[PDB]
Design a protein around this ligand. Structure first.
Ligand SMILES: [Mg+2]
Ligand SMILES: [Mg+2]
Lengths: 231, 231
């Protein structure tokens, strides 16, 4: 179960961090829907991990940490993740109703913030949003690779892992962010097969210099709030 | 792996959407049976796709999206799907017990709804129901065909694809629905080789006018609940 894990300290690793947007609030509002929805979320993501020969490093709550020996496979996985979650019949509209409510609640209490999906017409909304919203951050770089003798698993520490994590932290639900390093790790040909939007320099907590962010338009037409920067 | 994919924008495409009825609830009730049952489900469906020269567009959870250059091949596939799933020894009666429980749970809490299979005598039930219940929707029409350079795959977008998807969404487990367009895409001779029941005009979400629905009686004798319309 470790053949897909990047094992060479000299080989750059592409890390993908994911998290379910507003899962805490969803758990509170839908204790009856979340166990199943999250279980589905895990199954979908694990199928993608296998399909793109990536490696599941760990799961923390509903967050996934995935490693890939290939920058492109990581990007494909992230794109397919958004599409798969959008296309799946979640058997409930309650999650979407809650997401729209959260935007509305946030809008009234924050000046300079507008709901990115709650203002869409019903039919338009369902063509772009459906079910759990997963934020995804992707970064590529050399990592300090650690092997666990007891689990036979591999973990990745260092600034590279922290960079991937903070990139995910600023992404909104349904958004896929790639750092300049990840984006440029892809070959020129690979980049041209993708629909990407430059977001520009972004300030990440604990990172000295601004990081140029690239939005992978996995579900063309989606709008997002400003990045979840600290203050 | 794309020769069976409809590739001409002027050529009508027949799309088949499938999904496992109550898979979420089954996963919750049988985490020990579902991985294998779903794996079997995928193998059976993929054998049929190959047998009827159809094309697997994509898989979303346990849902299949299949395209066919031939309306009749699509209908044969759907009919054989129901029969194959019925005849297979799933090596468990747990799935059927759960399906019967779900009907009973739904009956007590809904006025005007009666269990379509939980009231069958044991021997009668097993002649008509066994294992995973797959809902199937079929529609024929011109599609916006998209080619993917990276996967070499073909996808189908537009109202035609959405129509096929919504047709599947209203079908019950073990039921095969064909829109008037799909049904009439078959030759007169082909239609006479089939056992079909007219269900009449049906309201589909996001569709302006009612759609006449036709039930392909793949397993004669089955009863179904009212169509899964929205409210
Ligand atoms: Mg979380
Ligand atoms: Mg499903």
């Amino acid at each position: 179960d470790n053949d897909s894990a990047p094992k060479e300290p000299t080989g750059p690793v592409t890390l993908i961090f994911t998290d379910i947007e507003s899962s805490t609030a969803l758990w509170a509002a839908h204790p009856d829907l979340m166990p199943d929805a999250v279980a589905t979320h895990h199954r979908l993501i694990r199928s993608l991990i296998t399909r793109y020969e990536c490696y599941e490093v760990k799961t923390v709550g509903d967050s996934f940490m995935i490693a890939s020996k290939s920058p492109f496979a990581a990007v494909q996985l992230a794109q397919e993740l958004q599409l798969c979650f959008l296309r799946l019949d979640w058997e409930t509209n309650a999650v979407d109703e809650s997401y729209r409510e959260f935007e509305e609640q946030r809008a009234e209490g924050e000046c300079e913030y507008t709901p990115p999906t709650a203002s869409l017409d019903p039919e338009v909304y369902s063509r772009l949003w459906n079910g759990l919203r997963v934020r995804v951050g992707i970064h590529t770089g050399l990592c300090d690779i650690r092997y666990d003798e007891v689990t036979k698993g591999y973990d990745y520490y260092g600034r590279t892992s922290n960079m991937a994590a903070r990139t995910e932290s600023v992404a909104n639900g349904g958004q896929v962010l790639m750092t300049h390093a990840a984006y440029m790790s892809l070959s020129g040909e690979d980049r041209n097969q993708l629909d990407v939007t430059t977001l520009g320099a972004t300030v990440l907590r604990g990172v000295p210099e601004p990081v140029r962010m690239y939005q992978l338009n996995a579900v063309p037409g989606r709008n997002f709030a400003a990045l979840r920067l600290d203050r």
